Ligand binder design. Structure first.
Ligand SMILES: [Zn+2]
Ligand SMILES: [Zn+2]
Lengths: 104, 105, 311, 145, 694, 90
DNA sequence: TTAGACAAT
DNA sequence: TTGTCTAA
């Protein structure tokens, strides 16, 4: 006449057993079914919080740098104006990394 | 690769679904089932109530009210027996009852 | 590392005359001798801060239940910290893990017990908050840890390679359900040790050079100017610099925070390729430091002016 | 390692809260397909043109500073090159398909935006969608800020 | 290509012969079936919202019962109809009908008479039925209520219209105004969000959370929320007339069902059974309910209708249990009828939150088109008209209270029919929404914006006039923000929104336009046989146990109805079986259904399941299913897992399962008029698309 | 305290005995077949069912309905248990 | 030492 | 949206 449930619930109704308190048996509320407080010795709850577990700068074009005079500069495009005109080209030198922009 | 001769023989064997846990320790527990009077209209074919007498609580199981499960209407439930010497899995119509303990009003 | 770019850096230079900017750096070259490089490779580690969430791999909380008398009932809270190994950080204050365990055993447990006694002195309600908060018109040592508090009943620390820690904060029973793991997480975002006053991060991997001179630069991210004056035998403090106008204005002077306003406006305009001539910048820096203090150009800077029609 | 395990570890570099091992894999396609982007332009831009400077009009508008640059004409008569979207390759979906034409976590450079088709002979509909992502990026970033 | 696919009439090349023929200028005897596909989403949505949806939206208005002086008066609408536009009574004319061309030329509104059957009853006994003229509502042209329905082009020229007249537009004071299709969140679906703004909504909230946009038969719309907390407790927040309600989860799950607490425990831990923190947290949610002694369902309902009673504005004579099922019927999962299926939906929305918070499933992107659908003009008519009917009944109550002050003779009514005459007339409060675009509703209609609804169908040319019927507007509130994430072209819009066809200024990225192939689902059919169909396949339902363990089974969500648990080794065999049932038009599967099989991989990918969508107001587009050779309506979330191909060269065996119809399907209508679009740079195409509209 | 132990049922009443057996020993093996809704219970009347793996077994309903797949599972320790009416107890 | 108040694009 | 000014 006994049912196997989780230890946190009554085994005759299905209702929730309260926390242990100032007595030696914890009882359900809606039926009055006493269970030993001593039976919660295997009520173990684990929780693990894991904090911390376990280039060539684009294509090049053979353009001379303003500062260092290197023969090539890496380029990147970005259409920064409206859709009416242009395409703004960003350059970056290979050696000394001097970045200038052209607006066409 | 075992086989079994499917010998459908026909009565509706009840199956129980406890809302408390598994009935793992059977003892002195009385089971009685109830059926509606008017078998004329086709609602009597589903009206059935199973009652469970225990000294502590009483468990009741419907087929129609709120909380009656939908597994035995959107799907059929059968029971195999498999008389092993003869090797025939003889099959009965069955129902599943989700029992709920009765308290008060 | 990053700085503040665009208009709002120029706003917080000119329009605000900000005493508290976000991300101030400072920059000191290294003396570039043999002993100074050896000392400064460790000084890079020493001037950083280290938070506890930086070297901690995982926290393990194992709440249990314990009843030992007819009255005494106890909630066993076996906290366990797994620290990340020493090989996975060679950037922070030479933290051999006995140092972070000493952090633990000295002050982290008291920092934890103050939080537990703040919470234990004590969302589950139907609140119906009366606003949504965001018109008809007709137009259209184990003994030290045990004596920290009586609640700590067990202590076990790792000894061979000092990578973990175990306590047992044995609280009594209470009516609410206690949220231990939230306290242990939110308390474990506190700074460990040797966090220098206001300096977060240092980088001397900027080995930049104009004449292949290998001029190592402590490109820090924090603002403490007399912090670096003890390291004069290693750093070349003669060509020190910062972003902050007020820090050098209170350390070196209004004539040396007059040549930092000019350099910073030139750097903000020079990120974006714009070349502003130095005569304009020198005129602005000689206007703002005219009264001897670093004034803004806002509404609260025209109260100094004389003619009220312009005001 | 076989391609199933490599595809598994790039699925694992994806789908994670770090996004620091994954952005590194962007910078290893994008530095290796920008070695096939320079070799084609050395094959076709100086001495591969039909009519050359000064007899070429477009080279005279480019090189004498009238309009354009040697990036617009390399997009006209050679590849469009890598599509960089917000500094990186265009985004994978929630299923690892970078675009519904392509297999989940496909290794080919075409799958991640390397266009390699010019405007002189047109671009196929995957690269046209990638190029419209890159156009709307700049247009939105101008229109907002 | 499949014959019957709407795109079999696509020309190989242009002809230029149709402008030098004897047949030119003779009207054809039927309209063109290519220009009439562009207002299906407008006309077929307004056709639902006047006959079927109005009959289903007067069933969901409760019997309005108030208190007379010691008598209870009950009002209920039985049936409301919208008559097609005629002349007013007392008019000497020859043809009683009114056509749109009169309403354009005379600068009037093209509108239809509205009337209803209100069934008044005092003290529980009926004493009459009244047929009451509520007001005038606008009529969409070429709908089932316009007078231009079913006309041939030669009889349509005769009434001053045009041949190939597609409807879709309201004449409001002489100015034609379309309703633009906004973007709304995907209806009846748990959208797992990670939004750190939600941390400030309570004392222990997390950045995590699962939202749901619930809509009940195209006339109601309510957003709800779930929140994971620092404890492991789950809250549940929902606004009801500008009142943010806080409701814990266990209170909801106890107020819904009569189950014992071990079953409510069991339903929330199905996949994660070896987790200790999870079982602890879903114990604590139920214990919070236990703390007040609310052990039964009736006692939980008593407590909830005790605490929430004053803000729900229920009458003084309801019990607490009756004002508790007034907030579970009109706020929480209103697309479900039964409280049993509301329960197993909150269990799935809770398990998705528990898998999100533990990092076992990734965020569903709210701005992606996978998790989005459109708000057609059938919703915004029907929701607003339902709300104005409820406002009309509340005005009748205020009219009785105005009669009771300065106390009248105040006897029985006896078909008095003066309070209805003194009642409010919803001509002008229904005209204001169209004539300005401003939605002044006390509900909010479950929406996210307030203005920008009706936009003038401008007609400067025909390129501009087509575009208003293909416009998909992201939001008229995002134009003020400084965001870029909502304005980003994403690869999930391959063929459902056009890449090039957008404006360039402040609305760049917001005002998207549909493609040519993409079409909005407007058909509303009945999914009554599909649960029994699924359970005849491997779907073991909720109550029984699948025969492998859980976490080796998939949830099934048949339009917000939790159905069952597909075994993991039988989920492809149900996905391809439902696709074969879809493209072959078998077994009452709609041809516009989604069979989305998000698989299990063990990595924190999308939250796995076998989702099935049958709703209206979605986006769908045809492909060719390669293994069948037949045209398949792929939805927005199916093609994120399908290997569609473009060219017959790029089709492989084993890898490829579909193929687009014609390879320029990704482009709009307006962007398919640019010659050689693949040769010029893409802002040039994006500029030409808004040049041709000027 | 006061347990209910109900005996009240207004339209219902108890039952006579039926033809299902009562004796379960080592010779019987309880199988729990879960069949579809439109599964006619006479279809496999001469056919076999698998006890391990799966098998696509035919029926006799119309000859063309016959494709049924049978999934042979492991014991779940299922919570549904059988009630066999014994003849010693009325 | 920290919250309302006041002006600008 | 800043940033300082005023009052508790
Ligand atoms: Zn109990
Ligand atoms: Zn250079």
């Amino acid at each position: 006449s006994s049912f196997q449930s989780d230890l946190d619930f009554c085994s005759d109704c299905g209702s929730v057993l309260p926390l242990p308190g100032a007595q030696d048996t914890v009882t359900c509320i809606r039926c009055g079914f006493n269970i030993n407080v001593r039976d919660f010795e295997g009520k173990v709850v684990k929780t693990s919080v894991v904090f911390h577990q376990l280039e060539c700068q684009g294509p090049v074009v053979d353009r001379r740098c303003p500062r260092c005079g290197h023969e090539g500069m890496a380029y990147h495009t970005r259409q920064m104006r409206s859709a009416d005109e242009g395409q703004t080209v960003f350059y970056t030198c290979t050696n000394c990394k001097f970045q200038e922009k052209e607006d066409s | 690769l075992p086989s079994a001769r499917w010998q459908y023989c026909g009565q509706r064997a009840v199956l129980v679904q406890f809302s408390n846990g598994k009935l793992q320790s059977p003892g002195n527990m009385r089971f009685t089932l109830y059926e509606n009077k008017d078998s004329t209209n086709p609602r009597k074919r589903n009206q059935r109530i199973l009652a469970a007498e225990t000294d502590r609580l009483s468990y009741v199981g419907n087929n129609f009210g709120t909380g009656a499960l939908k597994c035995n209407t959107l799907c059929r439930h059968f029971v195999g027996i498999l008389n092993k010497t003869s090797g025939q899995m003889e099959v009965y119509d069955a129902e599943l009852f989700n029992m709920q303990p009765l308290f008060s009003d | 590392m990053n700085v503040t770019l665009g208009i709002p850096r120029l706003r917080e230079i000119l329009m605000v005359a900000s005493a508290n900017i976000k991300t101030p750096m400072m920059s000191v070259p290294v003396l570039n001798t043999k002993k100074a490089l050896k000392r400064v490779k460790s000084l890079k580690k020493q001037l950083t801060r280290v938070c506890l969430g930086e070297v901690l791999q995982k926290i393990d909380v194992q709440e249990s239940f314990c009843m030992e008398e007819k009255q005494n009932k106890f909630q066993v809270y076996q906290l366990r910290f797994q620290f990340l190994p020493h090989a996975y950080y060679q950037q922070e204050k030479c933290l051999r893990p006995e140092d972070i365990l000493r952090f633990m055993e000295t002050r982290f447990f008291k920092l934890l017990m103050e939080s537990i006694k703040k919470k234990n002195n004590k969302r589950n309600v139907n609140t119906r908050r009366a606003t949504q908060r965001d018109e008809e018109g007709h137009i259209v040592r184990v003994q030290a840890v045990r004596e920290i508090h009586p609640f700590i009943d067990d202590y076990q620390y790792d000894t061979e390679e000092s990578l973990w820690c175990q306590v047992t904060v044995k609280l009594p029973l209470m009516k609410i359900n206690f949220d231990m793991s939230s306290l242990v997480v939110s308390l474990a975002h506190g700074a460990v040790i040797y966090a220098t006053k206001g300096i977060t991060r240092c980088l001397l991997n900027e080995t930049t050079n104009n004449k292949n001179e290998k001029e190592l630069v402590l490109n820090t991210e924090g603002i403490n100017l007399p912090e670096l004056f003890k390291y004069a035998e290693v750093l070349d403090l003669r060509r020190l610099y910062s972003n902050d106008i007020h820090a050098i204005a209170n350390t070196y002077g209004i004539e040396a925070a007059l040549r930092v306003i000019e350099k910073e406006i030139k750097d903000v305009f020079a990120v974006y390729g714009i070349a502003v001539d130095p005569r304009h910048l020198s005129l602005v820096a000689d206007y703002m430091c005219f009264e001897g203090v670093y004034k803004p150009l806002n509404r609260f800077g025209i109260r100094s002016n004389s003619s009220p029609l312009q005001q | 390692a076989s391609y199933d395990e490599v595809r598994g570890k790039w699925q694992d570099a994806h789908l994670g809260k770090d996004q620091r091992d994954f952005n590194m894999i962007d910078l290893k396609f994008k530095e290796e397909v920008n070695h096939y982007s320079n070799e084609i332009n050395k094959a076709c831009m100086p001495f591969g043109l039909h009519r050359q400077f000064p007899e070429n009009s477009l080279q005279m508008m480019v090189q004498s500073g009238a309009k354009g640059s040697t990036v617009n004409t390399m997009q006209i008569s050679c590849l469009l090159g890598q599509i960089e979207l917000e500094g990186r390759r265009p985004p994978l979906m929630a299923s690892g398909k970078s675009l519904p034409c392509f297999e989940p976590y496909e290794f080919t450079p075409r799958a991640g935006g390397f266009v390699t088709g010019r405007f002189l002979t047109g671009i196929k509909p995957p690269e046209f969608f990638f190029h419209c992502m890159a156009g709307r990026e700049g247009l939105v970033d101008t229109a907002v800020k | 290509m499949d014959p019957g696919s709407r795109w079999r009439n696509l020309p190989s090349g242009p002809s230029l012969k149709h402008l030098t023929d004897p047949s030119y200028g003779i009207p054809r005897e039927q309209q063109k079936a290519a220009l009439q596909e562009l207002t299906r989403a407008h006309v077929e949505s307004f056709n639902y919202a006047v006959h079927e949806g109005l009959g289903l939206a007067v069933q969901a208005i409760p019997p309005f019962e108030f208190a007379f002086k010691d008598e209870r008066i009950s009002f209920t609408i039985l049936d409301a109809v919208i008559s097609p536009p005629t002349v007013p009574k007392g008019t000497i004319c020859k043809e009683a009908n009114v056509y749109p061309a009169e309403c354009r030329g005379r600068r009037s509104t093209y509108r239809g008479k509205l009337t209803a059957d209100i069934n008044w009853a005092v003290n529980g006994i009926s004493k009459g039925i009244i047929k009451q003229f509520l007001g005038y509502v606008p009529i969409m042209v070429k709908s089932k209520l316009c007078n231009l329905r079913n006309l041939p082009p030669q009889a349509l020229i005769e009434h001053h219209e045009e041949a190939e007249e597609m409807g879709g537009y309201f004449i409001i004071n002489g100015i034609e105004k379309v309703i633009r299709m906004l973007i709304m969140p995907r209806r009846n679906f748990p959208i797992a969000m990670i939004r750190p703004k939600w941390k400030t909504r309570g004392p222990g909230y997390t950045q995590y959370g699962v939202s749901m946009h619930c809509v009940r038969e195209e006339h109601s719309a309510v957003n709800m929320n779930l929140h994971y907390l620092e404890n492991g407790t789950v809250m549940l927040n929902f606004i009801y007339r500008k009142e943010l309600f806080f409701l814990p989860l266990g209170f909801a799950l106890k107020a819904l069902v009569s189950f014992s607490d071990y079953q409510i425990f069991q339903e929330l831990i199905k996949g994660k059974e070896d987790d200790s923190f999870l079982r602890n947290s879903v114990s604590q949610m139920l214990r919070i309910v236990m703390e007040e002694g609310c052990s039964t369902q009736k006692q939980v309902l008593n407590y909830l209708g005790e605490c929430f009673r004053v803000k729900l504005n229920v009458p003084d004579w309801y019990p607490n249990e009756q004002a508790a099922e007034f907030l579970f019927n009109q706020c929480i999962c209103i697309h479900l009828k039964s409280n049993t299926e509301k329960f197993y939906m909150l269990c799935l929305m809770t398990r998705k939150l528990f898998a999100l918070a533990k990092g076992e499933c990734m965020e569903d992107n709210p701005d992606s088109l996978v998790n989005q659908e459109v708000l057609t003009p059938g919703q915004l008519f029907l929701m607003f008209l339902k709300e104005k009917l409820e406002g009309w009944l509340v005005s009748i109550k205020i009219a009785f209270d105005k009669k009771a002050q300065k106390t009248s003779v105040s006897m029985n009514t006896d078909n008095l029919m003066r309070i209805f005459t003194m009642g409010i007339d919803l001509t002008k409060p229904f005209e204001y929404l169209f004539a300005t675009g401003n939605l002044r509703s006390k509900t909010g209609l479950g929406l996210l914006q307030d203005s920008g609804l009706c936009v003038v169908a401008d007609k400067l040319n025909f390129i501009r006039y087509l575009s208003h019927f293909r416009c998909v507007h992201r939001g008229a509130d995002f134009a003020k923000m400084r965001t870029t994430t909502v304005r980003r072209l994403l690869p999930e819009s391959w063929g459902f929104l056009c890449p090039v066809h957008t404006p360039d200024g402040e609305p760049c990225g917001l005002m998207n336009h549909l493609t040519a192939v993409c079409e909005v689902v407007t058909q509303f059919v009945y999914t009554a046989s599909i649960p029994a169909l699924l359970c005849n396949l491997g779907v073991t339902p909720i109550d029984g146990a699948p025969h492998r363990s859980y976490s080796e089974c998939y949830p099934v969500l048949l339009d917000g109805v939790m159905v069952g648990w597909v075994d993991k080794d039988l989920a492809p065999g149900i996905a391809d079986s439902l696709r074969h049932f879809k493209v072959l038009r078998e077994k009452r599967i709609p041809p516009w259904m989604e069979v989305v099989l998000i698989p299990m991989t063990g990595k924190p990918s999308l939250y796995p399941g076998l989702f099935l969508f049958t709703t209206p107001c979605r986006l769908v587009r045809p492909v060719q299913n390669l293994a069948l050779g037949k045209e398949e309506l792929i939805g927005t979330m199916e093609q994120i897992f399908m290997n569609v191909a473009i060219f017959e060269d790029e089709v492989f065996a084993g890898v490829t399962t579909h193929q687009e119809l014609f390879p320029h399907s990704l482009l709009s209508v307006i962007a398919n008029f640019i010659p050689f679009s693949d040769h010029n740079q893409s802002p040039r195409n994006m500029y030409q698309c808004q040049m041709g509209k000027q | 305290s006061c347990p209910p132990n109900f005996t009240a049922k207004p339209p219902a009443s108890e039952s006579p005995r039926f033809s299902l057996e009562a004796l379960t020993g080592p010779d019987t093996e309880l199988w729990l077949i879960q069949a579809p809704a439109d599964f006619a219970p006479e279809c496999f009347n001469g056919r076999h069912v698998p006890l391990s793996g799966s098998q696509i077994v035919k029926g006799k309903l119309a000859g063309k309905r016959h494709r049924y797949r049978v999934l042979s599972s492991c014991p779940q320790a299922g919570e549904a248990t059988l009630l066999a009416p014994s003849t010693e107890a009325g």
